[PDB]
Amino acid sequence: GPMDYYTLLGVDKGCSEDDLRRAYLKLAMKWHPDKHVNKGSKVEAEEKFKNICEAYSVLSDNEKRVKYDL
């Protein structure tokens, strides 16, 4: 299973959908492929960006979020 999605995004389990979006934008920008494409951090960032997008894709969906919380 995944490392916890909330912790990855730096949010608490009871945060709002807008909190999730703000955290996603901040962290996705940190690891954005357009920043890392010519650096040795390309691989690190690819993995982190992927996991950030996965965390947001689950937690931003009301039903998938409640299922994750079970």
Residue numbers in the entry: 1 to 70
Sentences copied from the publication:
In the Laverania subgenus of malaria parasites, of which P. falciparum is the only human-infective member, a single Hsp70 chaperone, Hsp70-x, is exported to the host cell. Common to all Laverania parasites is an expanded set of exported proteins for host cell remodeling; thus, it is believed that Hsp70-x ensures the correct folding of these proteins, thereby supporting parasite survival and virulence functions. In addition to PfEMP1 and PfHsp70-x, J-dots contain multiple Hsp40 (also known as DnaJ) cochaperone proteins, which can stimulate Hsp70 activity. At least one of these cochaperones, PFA0660w (pf3d7_0113700), was shown to preferentially stimulate PfHsp70-x activity compared with a human Hsp70 (19).
Consistent with previous studies using full-length PFA0660w, the J-domain of this protein (PFA0660wJ) stimulated PfHsp70-x activity by ∼2-fold. We sought to investigate the structural basis of PfHsp70-x and Hsc70 stimulation by parasite cochaperones, focusing particularly on PFA0660w whose expression coincides with large-scale erythrocyte remodeling. To that end, we resolved the crystallographic structure of PFA0660wJ at 1.38 Å resolution and assigned the NMR spectra of PFA0660wJ in a sequence-specific manner. This allowed us to study the physical interaction of PFA0660wJ with PfHsp70-x or Hsc70 at amino acid–level resolution. As anticipated from the chaperone stimulation assays above, both PfHsp70-x and Hsc70 interacted directly with PFA0660wJ, as evidenced by changes in the intensity of [15N]-labeled PFA0660wJ NMR peaks corresponding to specific amino acids upon titration of this protein with unlabeled PfHsp70-x or Hsc70. Furthermore, we noted that PfHsp70-x produced larger changes in NMR peak intensity compared with Hsc70, suggesting that the PfHsp70-x–PFA0660wJ interaction is stronger than that between PFA0660wJ and the human chaperone, which is consistent with the biochemical assays above. To evaluate whether these interactions are compatible with the formation of canonical chaperone-cochaperone complexes, we mapped the PFA0660wJ amino acids showing the largest changes in NMR assays upon complex formation to the cochaperone domain structure; these amino acids are expected to define the direct protein binding interface. Both the PfHsp70-x and Hsc70 interactions primarily involved residues of the PFA0660wJ α-helix 2 (α2) forming a continuous binding surface toward the C terminus of that helix. Notably, these residues included PFA0660w H110, which is part of a conserved HPD motif found in Hsp40 cochaperones that is necessary for stimulation of Hsp70 activity.
